[model samples]
Target chain A: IVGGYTCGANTVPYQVSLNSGYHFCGGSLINSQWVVSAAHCYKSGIQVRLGEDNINVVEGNEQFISASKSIVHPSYNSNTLNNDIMLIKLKSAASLXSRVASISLPTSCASAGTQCLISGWGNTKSSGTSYPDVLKCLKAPILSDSSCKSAYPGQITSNMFCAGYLEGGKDSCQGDSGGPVVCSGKLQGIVSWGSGCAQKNKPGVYTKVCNYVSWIKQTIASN
Target chain B: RPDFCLEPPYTGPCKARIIRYFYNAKAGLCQTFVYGGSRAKRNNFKSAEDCMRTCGGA
Candidate 1:
């Protein structure tokens, strides 16, 4: 995350790393066996790592598990990046711990001006590759749908919303996709896309988590 | 009823690859495409007959 600081140990336990070879994206643990992430992060041979802080070293607290199944939204539009959410069923239920646990899904949609917490191991730089060794986080306020639409015309869907500084300084970046935007101790959004990392008037776009809460619960319950 | 076959074959941006069938309205045939496991649509099918059964002009 651009303009963010390293998160303290066990500060965000719900955070998980969606890794193929390295940390490619972020995810949130919603249950013992399920995680919520961005559909765009979908890929084969994914290894979901829990309790990860530093990607450069083996912390011993980490649990690496393969995905048993991944369900992306049926109407997800890759071109427009709409409905950009996915649920991953892990091969085994995670053993909840002090550094690994589940986060609650939001009971209501986050309104504009809600300050939310975003964390990831994504690139810290907007132009070049600079992934931090430890997880980083930033607190960004949710922006209004109208302003978000104005920022990204014809791109903002009801399934999406924006958060961060309109004046530009901090934002989620590439490799952060599929991470959590936690508001009020609940999963509010998933890092989806942005014009560029931390650009002015181009706040990070997120999948409206409230819209997919039902879908997530249903998918998990049935599957 | 909505024409489910008319929906374009959507290969989602995800990376998991599974060969799935979809009706090509223009070709009047069910063809195959690599489907990313997430973000499926009504147009996606498991077999040629399934695609044809739903979309083929009976």
Candidate 2:
């Protein structure tokens, strides 16, 4: 989250650092072995570090694991960035511990006006490309599709959703991709993309996670 | 007049309810209103009996 503050060490338990020596993206553990992230963040040599607070130094509670398998949504569109979600299966199951934990997934779509949260290690400025070293988090309220439609027009699809302030001082940005959008304690969306970082009237866009419950369940059950 | 609490609140194992007597114009004295969603602006209470009771309560 850009324009966000440094979070407490133990605030977000489900947070994981998607790393390749440095944090490139973020993710949330859904279970012992499965992690839900953004499909566009899919790339080679990406692993996850759980129970991570600060990435610069070794935190003894951190648990590192290899991303042995990745199942990106088959219908994902790189051009429009539709269906921007993916699942990473850990090579070894993560032990359930106090700091290392999983977040709850949504059972239903989040209605507009529902307040949610987004967190990450993204860039702090819209024009800048440098990313944050520590994790950042911010609050975002879900906007009605009608309001979002006006801002994103023709491009916003049912597979996507919008959240953030209209004034846009805060948002998720690069390196924050595949991070969590938790609404009322449930994993509601994944930080997919947006029209520039934290621009006014351009709330961050996300892949509507509730719409793909069947796919997630199927994937988990089969694998 | 009639029974105020028509149903016994579940008052489940986790939480307790606050009961109080307040002024009621109809009963010519005081009536009861179980603190609920519409009661206050936030409709949130730390305890069942926690409210500004000096003027309204007995």
Candidate 3:
């Protein structure tokens, strides 16, 4: 995350790292056995690492588990990037504890100007490559749908929202895709994509999680 | 007729429910249904009048 600070150990217990030998994406544990991430991150043999704080360190509390199954949104559009969310079922359920727990799903939509927390191990610099080993977080205020549309004309969809400074300084970049955008302690958005890493008037776009709550519940209930 | 009028009503998957209007091709009028509040398409309308004006075929 750009212009963010290192997260304290276990502060974001629900955060998970999607790995294929290394941290390639970030996700959130919605339940003991299920993780919610971006559909774009779906790939065979992806593992979910729970209770992770530092990627390079041993992080004794971390639990690495392969996905038993993954379900991408049925209507997920790769071209328009609509319905970019995905859910993964763990092969084994994670043990619930202070250092490893789930975050509640959004009960309602986050309104404009709502400051939300975005955590990730993604690139911190836009000009040069810099993926932090430790988790970092930034508080970004939600942008209105109209304004978001203005930023990315003919591209914004109802399923997507933007959150960041319009002038540009902080944002979720590469490797942050599928990370949590928590507001009021509820999972409201997912780091999906953006024009650039913290670029002017190009706030980071996110999958509006509230728009898929029913889909998420139904997917989990039947699977 | 507008092509969007031929599109089926999409309630989407979210639960931010709201009453929205859609064009019923067979009924040839505006109808109300629960909208999940996002991922909406041109087939969805904010009001019965809007739906009728756009797809009512009047």
- Please give, for residues A72-149, the per-residue lDDT of candidate 3 as tens digits: 999998767898899999999999989999999998999999998999888788566677888899999999999999
> If you assessed candidate 1 against the hidden native complex, which CAPRI class would it receive?
incorrect
Error of 3 at A159 (Å): 0.4
- lDDT (Cα, tens digit) per residue for candidate 2, span A163-183: 998897788876677889999
Encode model 1's per-residue lDDT on A88-170: one tens digit a residue. 99999999978999999989998899999999887788566577889999999999999999999998999999999999979
Q: Which ten residues in a row have the lowest lDDT in candidate 2 chain A?
A: A125-134
Clashing pairs in 1: A42-B15, A72-B38, A72-B39, A73-B39, A74-B40
Where does model 3 sit among the CAPRI classes? Answer: incorrect
Q: lDDT per prediction? A: 0.85, 0.73, 0.85
> Could you give candidate 2's per-residue lDDT for residues B1-58 as a string of tens digits?
4433223222111000122334443434334432211122222223334422322232
Interface RMSD of 1: 6.6
By DockQ, the better pick of 1 and 2 is: 1
Model 2 CAPRI quality: incorrect
Using DockQ, give the best candidate's number. 1
lDDT, residue A148, model 2: 82
Candidate that would win on TM-score: 1
So what's the TM-score on candidate 2?
A: 0.77
